[PDB]
């Protein structure tokens, strides 16, 4: 039947994505009915970036300090603002494409579609999750920074993420859409390091039950273990606790297998334990922990 | 490194979906032309065995329901290319991209647009293997999803969904309907080849390791493409081609490692292992990225 690692459609964010200069920094906005979303980062440059006293620069700027652009056509600016993070451009024109669409923050563990876009031009599209430590592992280079992340629950799109920056590890920190980030970090051009990360233990076990569904079960074993005793074991390996309400967002997947939560667990606790003396599940050598209960179940 | 896909946008506003009877699957709507596969003729019993040819010519353009959502799309002509059908419709779709007709080689990787009645689903990337099967992810339903690389912005659509495999593969079509690989559209047991690793691309990924500055499999030691061709079939690995000579071009210049001195450093880590250690914090060799994909996400 199948699994890879799936992100929504991109069109209806693709339909919103813009170019936004100040100065000599280019990035990309988010233009949904009058108003063009971006990092407010733009407005900084060199002899900024290390304490950036954003509300003393940005009232400094006039509207004709910002080039917007939607491909061939410029957007003239007619007012600007800022929320947190996010600097938010009015604009003379409705972008005719604004899909429906809602503002959410995700929680840690909850996963999301990147459009990676650079000089307004989207370029890839790819799934992600929200770290226990609020990074994501992105694919972001120079000129990323406003591409966004996004779920899509019928023909609704909740925008949850908004780029802008790389800790010297490789990973990536962002907002909401709100300009509130996830995580400690700042949007100043400081190296930053994040917590301790940990595994997202229900989406490891959810990877195991698509691994299941899709014919491959030699990892399970005759035991079974307690709630507790698991959490125990996974949080000396650096795994998020399992909640009661993860075993029940796992039920679902526990019926269509016929496998009980608990007993998936005592499974993992054998991985965690002896390792996967070099065998491999759905491709991986590693434990895979980017895909949610949901995710899996919408897919197989 | 991750698995990333192109955006979807250009083929979702290119997605119909066509039925017959109540045999309902995706199509691919290009100017005046619905694309399909021709499967749809059939009842389910009719899969079993078909007769495409006498099929066909019990139909009309009045039994094909094409539907751009609910919108339905007049049927004036339709003719058989191989797998595929063609249906000539009376509107030219507004939204159709620059676009091309490619036959990809195995190894080459490619975005998936997977949808369900004519609605998109969900977008990844998969890789054509040596056996020409993809290792895709598809339900009831959604033949007619349609493969695709986007080069500035011209689509080119590679691969149009037909069928599962009892392994649990994938197998398909080219846009003018031509199989990749020895399988036919009939719901019968076929069975693909043995699988091999994709050599192409497991150098890509140590070039891409070495621009990242992990670097310590690389040897003092070249050797003759046939030579390493020889020894990498004996560990189930594909024989390199000129042509993957040739698309290796742009990383070798970007390291100044040439194509076969890289060849002679995979050959040592087939032949010796890995002795424990990892690239690019890993034991296994990645064989699913591209040169091209490498340039995507490190440049
Ligand atoms: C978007 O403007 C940009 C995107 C970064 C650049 C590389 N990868 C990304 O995700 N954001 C920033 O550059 C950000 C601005 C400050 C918050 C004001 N800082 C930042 O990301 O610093 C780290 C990069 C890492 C990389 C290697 C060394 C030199 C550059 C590029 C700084
Ligand atoms: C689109 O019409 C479907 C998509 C399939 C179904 C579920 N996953 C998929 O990828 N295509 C088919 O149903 C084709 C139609 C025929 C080629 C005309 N048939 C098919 O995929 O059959 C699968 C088959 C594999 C084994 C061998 C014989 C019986 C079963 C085991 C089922």
Same mark, same amino acid.
């Given at each position: 039947?199948?699994?890879?690692?799936?992100?929504?459609?991109?069109?209806?964010?693709?339909?919103?994505?813009?170019?936004?200069?100040?100065?000599?920094?280019?990035?990309?906005?988010?233009?949904?009915?009058?108003?063009?979303?971006?990092?407010?980062?733009?407005?900084?440059?060199?002899?900024?970036?290390?304490?950036?006293?954003?509300?003393?620069?940005?009232?400094?700027?006039?509207?004709?300090?910002?080039?917007?652009?939607?491909?061939?056509?410029?957007?003239?600016?007619?007012?600007?603002?800022?929320?947190?993070?996010?600097?938010?451009?009015?604009?003379?024109?409705?972008?005719?494409?604004?899909?429906?669409?809602?503002?959410?923050?995700?929680?840690?563990?909850?996963?999301?579609?990147? $459009?990676?876009c650079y000089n307004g031009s989207p370029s890839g599209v790819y799934q992600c999750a929200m770290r226990p430590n609020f990074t994501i592992k992105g694919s972001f280079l120079n000129?990323?920074?406003?591409?966004?992340?996004?779920?899509?629950?019928?023909?609704?799109?909740?925008?949850?993420?908004?780029?802008?920056?790389? $800790?010297?590890?490789?990973?990536?920190?962002?907002?909401?859409?709100?300009?509130?980030?996830?995580?400690?970090?700042?949007?100043?051009?400081?190296?930053?390091?994040?917590?301790?990360?940990?595994?997202?233990?229900?989406?490891?076990?959810?990877?195991?039950?698509?691994?299941?569904?899709?014919?491959?079960?030699?990892?399970?074993?005759?035991?079974?273990?307690?709630?507790?005793?698991?959490?125990?074991?996974?949080?000396?390996?650096?795994?998020?606790?399992?909640?009661?309400?993860?075993?029940?967002?796992?039920?679902?997947?526990?019926? /269509?297998?016929?496998?009980?939560?608990?007993?998936?667990?005592?499974?993992?606790?054998?991985?965690?334990?002896?390792?996967?003396?070099?065998?491999?599940? $759905?491709?991986?050598?590693?434990?895979?922990?980017?895909?949610?209960?949901?995710?899996?179940?919408? /897919?197989?």
């Amino acid at each position: 039947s199948g699994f890879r690692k799936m992100a929504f459609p991109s069109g209806k964010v693709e339909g919103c994505m813009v170019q936004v200069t100040c100065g000599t920094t280019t990035l990309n906005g988010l233009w949904l009915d009058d108003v063009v979303y971006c990092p407010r980062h733009v407005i900084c440059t060199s002899e900024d970036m290390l304490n950036p006293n954003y509300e003393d620069l940005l009232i400094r700027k006039s509207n004709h300090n910002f080039l917007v652009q939607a491909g061939n056509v410029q957007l003239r600016v007619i007012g600007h603002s800022m929320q947190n993070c996010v600097l938010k451009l009015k604009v003379d024109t409705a972008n005719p494409k604004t899909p429906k669409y809602k503002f959410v923050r995700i929680q840690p563990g909850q996963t999301f579609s990147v $459009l990676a876009c650079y000089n307004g031009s989207p370029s890839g599209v790819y799934q992600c999750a929200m770290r226990p430590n609020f990074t994501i592992k992105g694919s972001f280079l120079n000129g990323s920074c406003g591409s966004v992340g996004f779920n899509i629950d019928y023909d609704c799109v909740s925008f949850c993420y908004m780029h802008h920056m790389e $800790l010297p590890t490789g990973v990536h920190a962002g907002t909401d859409l709100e300009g509130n980030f996830y995580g400690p970090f700042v949007d100043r051009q400081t190296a930053q390091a994040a917590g301790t990360d940990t595994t997202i233990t229900v989406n490891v076990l959810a990877w195991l039950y698509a691994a299941v569904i899709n014919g491959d079960r030699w990892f399970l074993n005759r035991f079974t273990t307690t709630l507790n005793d698991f959490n125990l074991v996974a949080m000396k390996y650096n795994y998020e606790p399992l909640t009661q309400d993860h075993v029940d967002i796992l039920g679902p997947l526990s019926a /269509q297998t016929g496998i009980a939560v608990l007993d998936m667990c005592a499974s993992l606790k054998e991985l965690l334990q002896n390792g996967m003396n070099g065998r491999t599940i $759905l491709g991986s050598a590693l434990l895979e922990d980017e895909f949610t209960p949901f995710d899996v179940v919408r /897919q197989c």
